[PDB]
Write a protein that binds this ligand. Structure first.
Ligand SMILES: CC(C)=CCSP(=O)(O)OP(=O)(O)O
Length: 294
């Protein structure tokens, strides 16, 4: 079955990258969501957020107007009350802005970590009316305006990290220059990457910004770039990129990949890479950002 193949592939990735994981957590996740994994926009992610340790996450999205993952997770015990603003945030998001899709992310050593809301691209002001957003979001209105973050294309709630991300369609001509990325990173006193990386970032169609309830500033930002096959991933930049691009499992022999380049002060600077397990994620990514499939 597809669900058994997926579970085996997930465990094999965790073993190969040395990622921490719990068999009991994987059982809980698949009891709730394994069927969803078989026929939606499913991806396996690895990231090198920690020193000499790779973490493994699995995630999916699907085109429903309602947040099915929240109900499944609550009924399943994967999402308990946190005693925290996150407890109502996703519900407020779905009340404030109509969604065309939703998704959910799981850490295989922990359980459910994120749920996201996918609207049609909307003006970022539509988000400011959400009651339980961190105060730092509304406090960054001028920052958003200055860096052409006006086209909101997703929102995420991170229940484990107690943070929220706003996602922007990086449509503006200034976002096609390397100086834009140097400027936005320097505005936060974040680490500026090499020229090679900057030349990859100028093609980013999606920019995420992370906010939390413990600081007035941006926690980290992330630049997303997609690659249509294993070979066009920039494997030479980091050994996790090379190993995952060459060895990640999928239902197709040569799948596409989504790479997230994260930057922070703390740490917050690392790479994330997701395999398009069924082949739906990467075309969907280009289509939602009004770009042709390269
Ligand atoms: C890609 C967007 C639309 C939802 C996925 S959640 P993410 O991987 O961007 O979240 P992190 O900030 O990396 O934890």
């Amino acid at each position: 079955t597809i669900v058994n193949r997926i579970r085996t592939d997930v465990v094999n990735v965790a073993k190969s990258f040395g990622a921490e994981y719990s068999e009991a957590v994987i059982d809980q996740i698949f009891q709730g969501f394994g069927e969803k994994f078989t026929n939606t926009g499913f991806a396996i992610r690895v990231q090198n957020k920690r020193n000499q340790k790779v973490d493994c996450n699995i995630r999916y999205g699907e085109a429903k107007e309602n947040c099915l993952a929240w109900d499944i997770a609550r009924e399943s015990g994967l999402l308990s009350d946190q005693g925290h603003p996150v407890d109502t945030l996703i519900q407020e998001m779905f009340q404030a802005i109509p969604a065309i899709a939703y998704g959910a992310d799981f850490d295989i050593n922990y359980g459910l970590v994120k749920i996201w809301h996918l609207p049609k691209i909307v003006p970022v002001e539509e988000a400011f009316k959400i009651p339980s957003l961190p105060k730092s979001v509304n406090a960054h209105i001028d920052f958003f305006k200055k860096y052409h973050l006006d086209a909101l294309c997703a929102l995420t709630v991170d229940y484990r990290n107690k943070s929220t991300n706003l996602y922007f369609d990086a449509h503006h001509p200034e976002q096609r220059t390397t100086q834009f990325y140097k400027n936005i990173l320097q505005s936060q006193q974040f680490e500026v990457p090499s020229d090679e990386v900057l030349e990859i970032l100028v093609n980013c169609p999606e920019i995420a910004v992370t906010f939390n309830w413990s600081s007035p500033g941006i926690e980290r930002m992330c630049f997303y770039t997609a690659f249509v096959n294993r070979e066009t991933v920039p494997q030479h930049i980091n050994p996790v990129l090379k190993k995952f691009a060459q060895e990640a499992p999928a239902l197709l022999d040569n799948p596409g990949f989504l790479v997230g380049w994260s930057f922070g002060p703390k740490k917050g600077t690392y790479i994330k890479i997701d395999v398009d397990y069924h082949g739906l994620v990467v075309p969907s990514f280009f289509h939602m950002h009004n770009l042709p499939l390269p």
